[PDB]
């Protein structure tokens, strides 16, 4: 009867500490009538550690010092195993029935961890391989959004083989100034540059390319910053909207009608990229206002102060209840998948 | 100095026996001056077995009976481990320096296995998570191809939630007859149906949906069936073309010019979907002849009789040499990646 939730958290990421806090928040909200937690922390070097609920954090109550307890209790995965897929090197680890992965950084978000979890036959919360891979690659994501006739910022994408040939002038004639230079990998916020003059571009292009093999160059979008939370698998729902002021305001100070059409856009974007479980969608609401999609994010924050849970809160969905729904959604997909993976 | 090549093969697939033969062919061609093999077979139930080069097949020399030796020597993966990532449950397994995965079926081809290999920090041959996930999903693949202004067959895509509402008439007005009904998952060839009359459609739609949650309905493309092999990472090359007659003919009986523009299309398609290592591209060459892309396949066959190696053979690239290049390409990507995965 009780479901065992393997929480996998942290990771090699600038947002590592956000994942620690999220795990602690999730762990306090998990309905203890339905779920027992099992905890696997991933350190800043990518090493996996089992921990007990009680003792998994160092300096828990200090945001400047908070760290993972690197217990050194290692984990082995048995690919193609059907039970006890997760194993202690050295013990026994509780059977995991569903994984809630909140690993920030490339591997935790780009589909790679999701593919490990599939290979271990583990149900798991959030987008599968494809939705995660596509969303995380801002170039592919915008192309799939574009084809779906949703608006995204006009943009050009360079690799290192192709950046050598960049002509600023032609870029400015096509996209204008300022230009936002971004590495295509979504995680996170690093290597970005707002280029104001044609002359600051080379340096932006070069910084970005230290982070990914692909760098986007985007035209400016002028307008307000709205964020909307999406939940579900086949029939996704949308939360109320929140406006980023510059500091988030929930619900947003916009028309009921405008909210509805951003809600609808958030859902169509989510379907087009093949997301499941959860995403936060970030749009620009122009003066017209066309709605232009900035980002589809398949790993939102789950702290008490994070936007995604705040948006569900303001929509009548409580934090405990959010978490429970994410788990039911993971188990529903899994058992639907189960039936499908029957070839001859 | 010698590189250790972990060959992972078989899988839960109708094409399981093709993977056995491929592994045997690869193993005989592997340059023994540069590479030692390590063998991991995956059985029809998805279980992993280490085997010795000498004794990995049952009834090797009989195509009707050939099977994997289920040695029962299990494998554990240490995610985030940096050496000995692959481990015997029960021994020692040789350090693997590069993985050559030829696992047919969903998990081996759709990016999931590739994500496990990333999580284990293992370089590996063929497309990474995204290129595999995208190529394997025929719906997403055609949308990305479409956006890249390459021609694909006109098509509509249904899920079970949406198939209930299918109107044949509107489908026929838009796409014509016959209609090819396909589950969106690329592997492989199963659940396909050629629907000749409006009346055979419901049944096709229903069979397909037993295999995937998404089913494509495609207009007919009238024209010749050309296949072209692609190799490389950042600067992919194309082989000579082969024509499927109805039985493959290499090289194809087509103009030098026509060959060149199918070659160019095969490469652009490969870039657009984010493929690496290898793909076979299958097109239709119409009477006009526009070239229309049928399939981008990121896991071609590697038997002696498979098309992909035959195409390189006829282009001056030998089988041993193909295999060696695929490995150098895997190691090159890996070490480029290495530098990138440096966040703060
Ligand atoms: N094309 C653009 N036009 C206008 N503003 C942009 C554009 N791209 C990014 N921004 C601004 O950059 C800020 C951060 O960019 P964002 O895409 O959110 O990257 P990250 O989320 O990683 O910081 C956003 O708050 C938005 O104000
Ligand atoms: N839209 C289409 N128009 C014309 N022929 C098609 C179409 N789709 C499939 N075919 C035919 O179906 C055969 C097999 O389809 P294919 O896409 O190759 O599936 P699989 O490779 O899994 O058999 C091809 O040889 C081609 O002749
Ligand atoms: Mg954003
Ligand atoms: Mg084909």
XYZ file of C-alpha atoms and ligand atoms in Angstrom:
744
model
C 0.000 0.000 0.000
C 2.557 2.708 0.822
C 4.379 3.803 -2.373
C 8.095 4.211 -2.184
C 9.283 7.535 -3.664
C 12.937 7.741 -4.629
C 13.900 11.345 -4.551
C 17.000 11.996 -6.588
C 18.439 15.435 -6.085
C 21.244 17.886 -6.467
C 23.652 17.514 -9.275
C 26.557 19.303 -10.906
C 24.922 22.583 -11.327
C 24.922 26.233 -10.434
C 21.341 25.510 -9.224
C 22.546 22.655 -7.050
C 21.449 24.395 -3.779
C 17.948 25.050 -5.238
C 17.658 21.193 -5.686
C 18.666 20.634 -2.043
C 16.003 23.009 -0.819
C 13.393 21.508 -3.227
C 14.112 18.008 -1.903
C 13.671 19.154 1.648
C 10.401 20.897 0.792
C 9.108 17.828 -1.107
C 10.107 15.553 1.671
C 8.108 17.594 4.236
C 5.061 17.723 2.069
C 4.999 14.071 0.846
C 1.737 12.593 2.131
C 3.024 10.080 4.697
C -0.176 8.065 4.335
C 0.711 7.151 0.740
C 4.477 7.489 0.362
C 7.778 6.577 2.113
C 10.786 8.497 0.830
C 14.090 7.058 -0.245
C 16.825 9.647 -0.728
C 19.609 9.708 -3.329
C 21.692 12.809 -3.433
C 24.013 13.631 -6.262
C 27.051 15.711 -5.366
C 28.740 18.600 -7.184
C 31.051 16.125 -8.775
C 28.265 13.860 -9.902
C 28.689 11.171 -7.315
C 25.591 9.423 -5.994
C 24.959 8.990 -2.197
C 22.142 7.302 -0.341
C 21.059 9.233 2.741
C 18.538 9.025 5.538
C 15.690 11.646 5.651
C 17.063 12.795 8.988
C 20.647 13.351 8.028
C 20.925 14.219 4.366
C 21.925 17.917 4.603
C 24.888 19.801 6.052
C 24.060 23.322 7.419
C 20.398 22.824 6.380
C 19.216 26.039 7.941
C 21.846 28.331 6.433
C 21.308 29.277 2.738
C 24.984 30.347 2.403
C 26.426 27.028 3.594
C 23.747 24.320 2.882
C 25.363 21.187 1.392
C 24.666 17.577 0.645
C 25.855 15.071 3.168
C 28.227 13.010 1.083
C 27.595 9.828 2.938
C 29.632 7.751 0.451
C 26.989 5.013 0.430
C 27.166 4.312 -3.319
C 24.406 3.301 -5.706
C 24.412 0.749 -8.536
C 21.785 0.518 -11.191
C 20.799 -2.827 -12.686
C 19.670 -2.001 -16.266
C 16.941 -4.389 -17.424
C 16.322 -5.407 -13.813
C 12.640 -5.482 -12.910
C 12.982 -5.098 -9.097
C 15.590 -3.824 -6.687
C 16.888 -1.942 -9.775
C 18.735 0.439 -7.493
C 21.415 -1.139 -5.378
C 23.813 -0.315 -2.647
C 27.435 -0.918 -3.419
C 28.331 -2.349 0.063
C 23.433 -3.302 2.661
C 19.970 -3.042 1.168
C 18.228 -0.048 -0.302
C 14.421 -0.013 -0.091
C 12.588 -1.071 -3.337
C 11.781 2.202 -5.214
C 8.297 2.287 -6.772
C 8.508 5.787 -8.390
C 11.373 8.262 -8.839
C 10.920 11.955 -8.434
C 14.015 13.380 -10.170
C 14.991 16.968 -9.341
C 18.540 16.868 -10.589
C 19.567 20.221 -12.029
C 22.333 20.559 -14.647
C 22.814 18.959 -18.026
C 22.431 15.250 -17.325
C 19.553 15.654 -14.885
C 17.534 17.728 -17.274
C 18.487 16.854 -20.839
C 16.919 13.394 -20.949
C 20.029 11.436 -19.984
C 18.874 10.691 -16.396
C 15.393 9.995 -17.683
C 16.926 7.430 -20.043
C 18.784 5.742 -17.209
C 15.482 5.557 -15.319
C 13.745 3.940 -18.332
C 16.604 1.483 -18.661
C 15.974 0.536 -15.076
C 12.230 0.175 -15.741
C 11.495 2.847 -13.084
C 8.404 5.016 -13.301
C 9.412 8.604 -12.787
C 8.028 12.103 -12.501
C 8.325 14.690 -15.301
C 9.096 14.593 -19.009
C 10.420 11.435 -20.628
C 13.527 11.311 -22.838
C 12.238 13.188 -25.848
C 10.306 15.988 -24.112
C 13.333 16.662 -21.835
C 15.939 16.465 -24.664
C 13.861 18.750 -26.912
C 12.914 21.361 -24.258
C 16.497 21.496 -22.979
C 17.892 22.291 -26.376
C 16.691 25.837 -27.003
C 17.464 25.633 -30.711
C 15.465 22.411 -31.338
C 12.714 23.648 -28.960
C 12.207 26.909 -30.931
C 12.209 25.049 -34.219
C 9.519 22.643 -32.956
C 7.542 25.643 -31.499
C 7.953 27.503 -34.775
C 6.607 24.576 -36.813
C 3.670 24.398 -34.416
C 2.832 28.015 -35.461
C 3.578 29.381 -32.034
C 5.561 32.648 -31.916
C 9.152 32.591 -30.617
C 11.781 35.356 -30.861
C 13.388 35.554 -34.232
C 16.808 33.872 -34.041
C 19.866 32.363 -35.675
C 21.851 29.414 -34.319
C 25.659 28.993 -34.545
C 28.076 26.065 -33.806
C 31.860 26.631 -33.481
C 32.355 25.504 -37.081
C 29.955 28.176 -38.176
C 30.599 31.015 -35.677
C 33.930 31.744 -37.330
C 31.813 33.051 -40.286
C 29.326 35.189 -38.259
C 28.768 38.566 -39.802
C 27.410 41.010 -37.202
C 26.026 43.358 -39.900
C 23.862 40.826 -41.533
C 22.720 39.752 -38.028
C 21.788 43.259 -37.078
C 19.982 43.799 -40.400
C 17.949 40.715 -39.744
C 17.429 40.673 -35.945
C 18.224 44.182 -34.750
C 19.826 45.344 -31.550
C 20.081 44.500 -28.818
C 20.716 40.820 -29.491
C 20.537 38.138 -26.843
C 23.287 35.603 -27.128
C 22.532 32.229 -25.435
C 24.110 28.830 -25.467
C 21.486 26.404 -26.800
C 21.635 24.240 -23.715
C 18.953 25.431 -21.368
C 20.751 25.021 -18.066
C 21.079 27.574 -16.990
C 21.273 31.349 -17.356
C 24.994 31.131 -17.868
C 26.841 32.267 -20.878
C 23.958 34.612 -21.693
C 24.837 38.164 -22.875
C 22.777 41.123 -23.867
C 24.638 42.731 -26.758
C 23.813 46.436 -27.172
C 26.260 47.428 -29.931
C 27.560 45.554 -32.924
C 31.020 45.697 -31.247
C 30.210 43.715 -28.091
C 28.907 40.752 -30.147
C 32.152 38.837 -30.848
C 32.910 38.579 -27.188
C 29.338 37.336 -26.386
C 29.536 34.756 -29.120
C 32.870 33.559 -27.762
C 31.798 33.298 -24.045
C 28.671 31.335 -24.965
C 30.605 28.825 -27.071
C 32.647 27.920 -23.983
C 29.436 26.464 -22.592
C 27.781 24.684 -25.561
C 28.573 23.630 -29.086
C 25.582 25.678 -30.178
C 24.777 29.290 -29.485
C 21.540 31.083 -30.296
C 21.340 34.722 -31.321
C 17.973 36.181 -30.653
C 16.163 39.433 -31.577
C 14.765 41.415 -28.623
C 11.157 40.885 -27.606
C 9.599 43.939 -26.123
C 6.852 43.156 -23.607
C 5.785 41.891 -20.179
C 7.084 38.647 -18.656
C 4.303 36.174 -17.819
C 4.817 32.620 -16.425
C 2.264 29.839 -16.404
C 2.484 26.402 -14.868
C 1.407 23.292 -16.702
C 0.503 19.929 -15.251
C -0.602 16.628 -16.747
C 0.242 14.083 -19.328
C -2.285 13.655 -22.171
C -4.609 16.415 -21.124
C -2.344 19.016 -19.589
C -3.949 21.771 -17.337
C -2.688 25.377 -16.844
C -2.370 27.371 -13.609
C -3.144 31.017 -13.220
C -0.409 33.360 -14.629
C 2.306 35.233 -12.679
C 4.096 38.352 -13.920
C 7.813 38.898 -13.451
C 8.086 42.590 -12.439
C 11.336 44.324 -13.630
C 9.789 39.847 -8.062
C 6.784 37.850 -9.211
C 3.145 38.786 -8.953
C 0.479 36.212 -8.599
C -1.917 36.244 -10.099
C -0.910 38.511 -12.907
C -2.603 41.853 -13.491
C -3.925 40.985 -16.939
C -7.352 40.462 -18.529
C -9.249 37.210 -17.902
C -9.224 36.772 -21.691
C -5.435 37.372 -22.014
C -4.803 34.917 -19.207
C -6.894 32.356 -21.103
C -5.032 32.688 -24.327
C -1.547 32.461 -22.600
C -2.909 29.369 -20.773
C -3.888 27.909 -24.145
C -0.480 28.750 -25.628
C 1.358 27.212 -22.651
C -0.580 23.930 -23.213
C -0.052 23.788 -27.047
C 3.721 24.499 -26.563
C 3.805 21.689 -23.938
C 2.120 19.245 -26.391
C 4.291 20.243 -29.326
C 7.589 19.517 -27.448
C 6.142 16.253 -26.000
C 6.390 17.341 -22.334
C 4.775 15.224 -19.511
C 4.241 15.696 -15.775
C 5.173 19.347 -15.373
C 6.597 22.389 -17.152
C 6.781 26.109 -16.474
C 6.157 28.185 -19.664
C 7.641 31.789 -19.858
C 6.230 34.129 -22.461
C 6.400 37.733 -23.481
C 3.101 39.567 -23.721
C 3.649 42.382 -26.182
C 1.709 45.621 -26.501
C -0.484 44.060 -29.290
C -0.212 41.711 -27.626
C 0.939 38.731 -29.517
C 2.208 36.215 -27.122
C 5.812 35.081 -27.771
C 7.240 32.008 -26.036
C 10.587 32.595 -24.308
C 11.208 29.223 -22.600
C 9.567 25.886 -21.858
C 11.137 24.578 -18.705
C 10.671 20.873 -17.835
C 12.428 21.138 -14.493
C 10.845 23.941 -12.461
C 11.745 24.698 -8.849
C 9.933 23.032 -6.076
C 11.026 25.069 -3.150
C 8.366 26.897 -1.067
C 9.421 30.143 -2.734
C 9.632 28.727 -6.372
C 7.177 30.014 -8.969
C 5.821 26.733 -10.281
C 4.209 25.560 -6.942
C 3.191 29.146 -6.127
C 1.164 29.174 -9.453
C -0.653 25.963 -8.521
C -1.219 27.286 -5.013
C -2.992 30.358 -6.458
C -5.000 28.037 -8.675
C -6.372 26.000 -5.796
C -3.767 23.206 -5.956
C -1.883 22.717 -2.688
C 1.794 21.732 -2.489
C 1.204 18.314 -1.007
C -1.485 17.780 -3.614
C 0.762 18.942 -6.522
C 3.468 16.403 -5.460
C 0.909 13.618 -5.121
C -0.495 14.395 -8.559
C 3.003 14.379 -10.134
C 3.523 10.907 -8.724
C 0.146 9.588 -9.936
C 0.950 10.997 -13.354
C 4.345 9.201 -13.394
C 2.698 5.893 -12.440
C -0.096 6.339 -14.999
C 2.382 6.923 -17.813
C 4.427 4.000 -16.699
C 1.616 1.495 -16.730
C 0.374 2.832 -20.135
C 3.886 2.469 -21.427
C 3.967 -1.000 -20.022
C 1.306 -2.258 -22.275
C 3.039 -0.649 -25.275
C 6.356 -2.146 -24.797
C 5.107 -5.428 -26.279
C 6.796 -6.221 -29.569
C 7.177 -9.615 -31.065
C 47.317 1.866 -26.110
C 44.698 -0.749 -27.036
C 41.181 0.754 -26.729
C 38.558 -1.328 -25.056
C 35.313 -1.501 -27.080
C 32.202 -2.539 -25.190
C 29.822 -3.972 -27.680
C 26.285 -3.953 -26.388
C 23.893 -5.935 -28.512
C 20.577 -7.601 -29.002
C 17.591 -6.345 -27.177
C 13.849 -6.853 -26.971
C 13.122 -6.515 -30.572
C 11.819 -8.168 -33.684
C 15.267 -7.242 -35.119
C 17.034 -8.939 -32.233
C 18.710 -11.566 -34.519
C 19.974 -8.793 -36.871
C 21.818 -7.318 -33.776
C 23.393 -10.716 -33.019
C 24.706 -11.021 -36.543
C 25.903 -7.357 -36.540
C 27.853 -7.946 -33.319
C 29.527 -10.979 -34.770
C 30.429 -9.095 -37.949
C 31.777 -6.111 -35.954
C 33.729 -8.356 -33.708
C 35.485 -10.025 -36.686
C 36.311 -6.752 -38.301
C 37.478 -4.792 -35.197
C 41.121 -3.898 -35.833
C 42.878 -6.047 -33.216
C 45.844 -3.674 -33.252
C 43.730 -0.879 -31.748
C 40.797 -2.495 -29.950
C 39.956 -5.350 -27.514
C 36.270 -6.231 -27.385
C 34.143 -6.596 -24.305
C 30.750 -8.178 -24.941
C 27.410 -7.387 -23.288
C 24.417 -9.092 -24.734
C 20.893 -8.072 -23.953
C 18.296 -10.829 -24.097
C 14.739 -10.857 -25.460
C 13.515 -10.046 -22.019
C 15.905 -7.175 -21.566
C 18.346 -8.875 -19.273
C 22.030 -8.024 -19.597
C 24.743 -10.778 -19.852
C 28.497 -10.526 -20.111
C 29.967 -13.049 -22.535
C 33.308 -14.097 -23.935
C 34.020 -13.446 -27.686
C 34.343 -17.193 -28.136
C 31.111 -18.287 -26.577
C 28.498 -15.581 -26.889
C 26.135 -17.189 -29.449
C 23.986 -20.321 -29.511
C 23.568 -21.932 -33.000
C 25.735 -19.145 -34.506
C 25.812 -20.667 -37.948
C 22.078 -21.268 -38.320
C 19.965 -18.154 -39.139
C 16.758 -19.943 -38.004
C 18.056 -20.820 -34.532
C 20.817 -18.237 -33.679
C 20.443 -17.007 -30.075
C 22.279 -15.143 -27.387
C 24.076 -17.210 -24.826
C 22.338 -16.119 -21.662
C 25.340 -16.568 -19.482
C 23.618 -14.973 -16.458
C 26.746 -12.979 -15.612
C 24.925 -9.759 -14.661
C 25.996 -6.161 -15.151
C 25.701 -3.166 -12.814
C 26.152 0.398 -13.864
C 27.648 2.962 -11.501
C 26.058 6.301 -12.550
C 28.453 9.201 -11.961
C 31.342 6.741 -11.706
C 34.374 7.811 -13.716
C 36.032 4.364 -14.122
C 34.949 0.755 -13.937
C 31.459 2.229 -14.580
C 30.280 -1.174 -15.725
C 30.386 -3.864 -13.097
C 29.841 -7.526 -12.673
C 27.254 -8.508 -10.139
C 29.245 -11.499 -8.704
C 34.458 -11.029 -10.765
C 35.870 -8.149 -12.764
C 34.785 -6.811 -16.109
C 37.471 -5.129 -18.230
C 37.466 -1.256 -18.113
C 35.385 -0.105 -21.152
C 36.862 2.883 -23.012
C 34.120 3.260 -25.704
C 30.714 1.615 -26.177
C 29.430 0.580 -29.537
C 25.681 0.158 -28.916
C 23.710 -1.905 -31.439
C 20.666 -2.579 -29.331
C 17.538 -2.714 -31.469
C 14.064 -1.968 -30.056
C 12.680 1.016 -28.216
C 15.142 1.541 -25.376
C 18.231 0.814 -27.458
C 17.283 3.283 -30.121
C 15.121 6.011 -28.616
C 17.824 7.733 -26.573
C 17.195 5.888 -23.311
C 20.303 3.644 -23.575
C 22.309 6.598 -24.799
C 21.237 8.455 -21.653
C 22.348 5.597 -19.433
C 25.714 5.684 -21.213
C 26.045 9.455 -20.595
C 25.127 8.939 -16.960
C 27.974 6.489 -16.769
C 30.334 8.970 -18.461
C 30.972 6.447 -21.284
C 31.890 7.605 -24.766
C 29.726 5.789 -27.250
C 29.107 5.359 -30.947
C 26.109 6.909 -32.745
C 23.611 9.652 -31.978
C 23.377 11.139 -28.503
C 20.121 11.492 -26.547
C 18.435 14.171 -28.603
C 19.322 12.973 -32.118
C 18.175 9.419 -31.194
C 14.957 10.553 -29.406
C 14.023 12.881 -32.287
C 14.834 10.480 -35.174
C 13.029 7.620 -33.424
C 9.838 9.576 -33.085
C 8.573 9.806 -36.656
C 6.126 12.574 -35.799
C 8.723 14.881 -34.154
C 11.283 13.936 -36.857
C 8.955 15.020 -39.715
C 8.072 18.227 -37.926
C 11.770 19.091 -37.474
C 12.437 18.097 -41.161
C 9.459 20.170 -42.256
C 10.698 23.259 -40.400
C 14.089 22.743 -42.024
C 12.314 23.126 -45.427
C 13.007 19.559 -46.407
C 10.120 17.675 -48.063
C 8.415 14.843 -46.150
C 5.139 13.069 -47.008
C 2.111 15.048 -46.055
C 0.715 13.629 -42.800
C -1.514 13.869 -39.755
C -0.678 12.497 -36.307
C -3.183 10.922 -33.863
C -2.987 9.848 -30.153
C -5.659 7.579 -28.585
C -7.406 10.623 -27.116
C -7.682 12.050 -30.579
C -8.150 8.941 -32.777
C -11.673 8.506 -31.451
C -12.487 11.689 -33.485
C -10.739 10.684 -36.773
C -12.858 11.407 -39.787
C -11.716 9.294 -42.754
C -13.398 11.642 -45.277
C -11.576 14.697 -44.226
C -8.361 12.597 -44.202
C -8.930 11.388 -47.708
C -9.778 14.914 -48.905
C -6.527 16.130 -47.485
C -4.081 13.223 -48.005
C -5.691 10.963 -50.588
C -5.605 7.216 -50.914
C -3.875 5.018 -50.266
C -2.868 6.183 -46.797
C 0.013 4.727 -44.845
C -0.768 4.247 -41.207
C 2.323 4.043 -38.923
C 2.900 4.140 -35.221
C 5.147 7.144 -34.529
C 7.789 5.032 -32.862
C 10.308 4.091 -35.487
C 11.087 0.554 -34.400
C 10.199 -1.141 -36.431
C 8.016 -1.869 -39.452
C 5.314 -3.213 -37.204
C 1.860 -1.887 -36.930
C 2.225 -0.375 -40.402
C -0.759 -0.703 -42.805
C -1.351 0.400 -46.329
C -4.981 1.502 -46.451
C -6.464 1.332 -49.965
C -10.118 2.189 -49.262
C -11.715 4.517 -46.775
C -13.222 1.384 -45.127
C -9.978 -0.362 -44.139
C -8.760 2.732 -42.227
C -10.409 2.201 -38.809
C -8.803 -1.163 -38.442
C -5.327 0.228 -39.408
C -5.688 3.056 -36.950
C -6.626 0.583 -34.230
C -3.743 -1.929 -34.862
C -1.156 0.861 -34.862
C -2.387 2.295 -31.560
C -1.648 -1.061 -29.912
C 2.007 -0.285 -30.546
C 2.387 3.449 -29.750
C 0.444 6.267 -28.185
C 0.877 8.137 -31.448
C 0.030 7.054 -34.954
C 0.909 8.874 -38.158
C -1.299 8.923 -41.233
C 0.639 9.653 -44.335
C -0.230 10.505 -47.972
C 1.358 8.230 -50.601
C 4.626 9.282 -52.199
C 4.996 8.048 -55.705
C 8.619 7.489 -56.729
C 11.833 5.464 -56.500
C 13.372 4.361 -53.191
C 16.932 5.642 -52.702
C 19.086 5.109 -49.553
C 22.198 7.035 -48.624
C 24.571 6.499 -45.743
C 25.829 9.332 -43.602
C 28.884 9.401 -41.389
C 30.438 12.013 -39.127
C 29.706 14.388 -36.357
C 30.083 18.108 -37.175
C 30.880 17.687 -40.822
C 28.902 14.647 -41.869
C 29.869 12.868 -45.207
C 27.512 10.941 -47.566
C 28.082 7.588 -49.289
C 27.031 6.736 -52.784
C 23.255 5.988 -53.149
C 21.554 2.562 -53.372
C 18.131 1.945 -54.912
C 15.592 -0.406 -53.376
C 14.147 -2.304 -56.383
C 10.438 -3.334 -55.973
C 16.721 -6.112 -53.476
C 19.118 -3.182 -53.364
C 21.272 -1.846 -56.149
C 24.540 -0.193 -55.478
C 25.335 2.227 -56.704
C 22.008 3.515 -57.847
C 21.201 4.002 -61.520
C 20.645 7.746 -61.269
C 22.364 10.885 -62.587
C 25.591 12.101 -60.950
C 23.723 15.362 -60.300
C 20.677 13.623 -58.712
C 22.982 11.580 -56.518
C 24.626 14.825 -55.383
C 21.439 16.523 -54.415
C 20.123 13.427 -52.449
C 23.562 13.338 -50.740
C 23.105 16.999 -49.813
C 19.567 16.356 -48.550
C 20.695 13.350 -46.477
C 23.316 15.587 -44.752
C 20.936 18.565 -44.071
C 18.286 16.133 -42.643
C 21.039 14.599 -40.438
C 22.046 18.082 -39.139
C 18.479 19.220 -38.579
C 17.618 16.214 -36.309
C 20.993 16.526 -34.476
C 22.289 13.073 -35.512
C 25.965 12.033 -34.826
C 28.133 9.057 -35.778
C 25.928 7.357 -38.349
C 22.498 7.387 -39.985
C 20.918 5.806 -43.041
C 18.585 8.260 -44.886
C 15.702 6.798 -47.073
C 14.094 9.082 -49.611
C 11.655 8.954 -52.455
C 12.867 10.317 -55.768
C 9.771 11.403 -57.645
C 9.328 11.816 -61.385
C 10.064 15.609 -61.078
C 11.938 14.670 -59.087
C 11.586 16.426 -55.835
C 13.264 14.429 -53.213
C 11.016 13.485 -50.254
C 12.499 12.099 -47.033
C 10.878 8.869 -45.822
C 13.041 7.976 -42.789
C 16.198 8.992 -40.950
C 17.491 5.913 -39.227
C 20.100 6.336 -36.449
C 20.598 2.618 -35.952
C 21.407 1.000 -39.301
C 22.394 -2.647 -39.701
C 25.955 -3.660 -39.495
C 25.807 -7.147 -40.810
C 27.855 -8.036 -43.937
C 24.637 -7.968 -45.953
C 23.204 -4.682 -44.395
C 22.826 -1.628 -46.623
C 24.642 0.949 -44.528
C 28.133 -0.757 -44.666
C 27.511 -1.831 -48.275
C 27.061 1.934 -49.165
C 30.380 2.846 -47.541
C 32.028 -0.135 -49.206
C 30.938 1.177 -52.635
C 32.234 4.591 -51.632
C 35.735 3.366 -50.885
C 35.247 2.917 -47.120
C 35.989 -0.615 -45.918
C 34.081 -2.340 -43.105
C 36.966 -2.438 -40.678
C 37.635 1.191 -41.511
C 33.952 2.229 -41.048
C 33.936 0.646 -37.528
C 37.227 2.310 -36.622
C 35.925 5.677 -37.790
C 32.697 5.281 -35.757
C 34.815 4.711 -32.674
C 37.096 7.709 -33.328
C 33.995 9.818 -33.821
C 32.546 8.633 -30.468
C 35.809 9.467 -28.671
C 36.094 12.864 -30.384
C 32.589 13.853 -29.319
C 33.240 12.646 -25.842
C 36.363 14.674 -25.281
C 34.695 17.795 -26.831
C 31.781 17.242 -24.520
C 34.193 16.891 -21.680
C 35.391 20.390 -21.918
C 31.788 21.647 -22.103
C 30.528 19.992 -19.077
C 32.179 22.659 -16.912
C 29.625 24.775 -15.093
C 30.215 26.682 -11.944
N 14.968 37.671 -26.847
C 14.793 38.351 -25.714
N 14.143 39.519 -25.701
C 13.949 40.197 -24.596
N 14.365 39.804 -23.409
C 15.025 38.659 -23.268
C 15.299 37.846 -24.434
N 15.968 36.793 -24.005
C 16.129 36.932 -22.685
N 15.552 38.031 -22.258
C 15.574 38.529 -20.899
O 16.577 37.790 -20.295
C 16.191 37.419 -19.012
C 16.737 36.059 -18.775
O 16.662 35.329 -19.982
P 16.165 33.843 -19.918
O 15.783 33.370 -21.254
O 15.137 33.769 -18.850
O 17.490 33.084 -19.471
P 17.631 32.475 -18.003
O 16.244 31.980 -17.687
O 18.539 31.292 -18.158
O 18.062 33.685 -17.252
C 14.696 37.343 -19.048
O 14.236 37.858 -17.819
C 14.318 38.315 -20.108
O 14.031 39.512 -19.400
N 4.026 7.578 -47.491
C 4.429 6.548 -48.235
N 4.305 6.566 -49.565
C 4.707 5.569 -50.317
N 5.264 4.472 -49.847
C 5.453 4.316 -48.541
C 5.030 5.356 -47.629
N 5.326 4.932 -46.416
C 5.868 3.716 -46.538
N 5.954 3.369 -47.801
C 6.436 2.100 -48.302
O 6.446 1.287 -47.181
C 7.590 0.497 -47.174
C 8.015 0.369 -45.757
O 7.766 1.596 -45.102
P 8.867 2.155 -44.137
O 8.631 3.577 -43.854
O 10.185 1.786 -44.711
O 8.583 1.321 -42.812
P 9.586 0.178 -42.332
O 10.945 0.717 -42.697
O 9.464 0.156 -40.838
O 9.109 -0.962 -43.161
C 8.624 1.280 -47.923
O 9.354 0.351 -48.692
C 7.825 2.108 -48.865
O 7.820 1.361 -50.072
Mg 12.954 32.430 -18.632
Mg 12.444 3.008 -44.799
